[PDB]
Amino acid sequence: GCGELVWVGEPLTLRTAETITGKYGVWMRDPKPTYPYTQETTWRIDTVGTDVRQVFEYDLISQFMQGYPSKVHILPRPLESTGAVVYLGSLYFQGAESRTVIRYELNTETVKAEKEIPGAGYHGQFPYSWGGYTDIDLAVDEAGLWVIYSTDEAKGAIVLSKLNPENLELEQTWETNIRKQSVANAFIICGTLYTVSSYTSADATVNFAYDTGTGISKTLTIPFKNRYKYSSMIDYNPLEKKLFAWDNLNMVTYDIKLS
Ligand SMILES: [Ca+2]
Ligand code: NA
């Protein structure tokens, strides 16, 4: 049931990192679980530092919330920032100190594709407002896989592109009028891009929207609470119909409502 975001719920804390290594990170479930994973399988990456390669994998939600991983993957090259996503059994992440997106098949621990995002800024050119090298932000919605970034030609404004999940080819790109470094993070619900206004305020908002299906740029004032005052990662999961976020060592989730 597609529609426009009209409400976000309170953040619920599901797991809390115990070390500075997890002050920021990314955690995710696959909207299209493929064998041997299911809808419960959760991945977790603590992303503080310059040699991030451990992907924590949990078979059951109970294990994500309590206990050790079922499995740890060692990525063949360090991962950059908090923007990665899992889709169709592959982890999609950005090579550190590069503009390359890498497709890592989880069940075989094999790199299946690599692709430079043409013209994309990286490593502090067009981060989100908190920095953290967040130049390139992958996304999964109801129609598939996207990447959110900017370029010199776009002059810091958010660009978004549909991505072929098999070979990482860019299927179509849109250009917004939202300065990327002026928002705390971004996500896509039903082909519409949403931005969050601040990463520190307990009274932030979802403040912009750009509908790729009609080209309309829009302004909103939907309350969004950063319960722990440092949201480093905010994504949308079209299967659970919920936002997944990482807020100052805390892995939280947000209920939503669409019109
Ligand atoms: Ca995001
Ligand atoms: Na992302």
Author numbering: 244 to 502
Reproduce, without paraphrasing, sentences from the article in which this PDB structure was first reported.
Overall, nine variants (T256M, R296H, L303I, S313F, V329M, S331L, E352K, A427T, and V499I) were considered likely to be benign. Assessment of spent media from cells expressing each of the 16 full-length myocilin variants revealed WT-like secretion for T256M, R296H, L303I, S313F, V329M, S331L, T353I, A445V, V449I and K500R. Structural integrity was further confirmed by high-resolution crystal structures, which were solved for 11 OLF variants. No gross changes from WT OLF were detected for the structures of T293K, R296H, L303I, V329M, S331L, E352K, T353I, K398R, A445V, V449I or K500R, indicating that these mutations are accommodated within the native five-bladed β-propeller fold and do not perturb the dinuclear calcium-containing site. In addition to the five variants that we predicted initially to be benign (T293K, T353I, K398R, A445V and K500R), our study reveals seven more (T256M, R296H, L303I, V329M, S331L, E352K and V499I) that are indistinguishable from WT OLF across multiple assays. Thus, our data indicate these should also be considered benign.
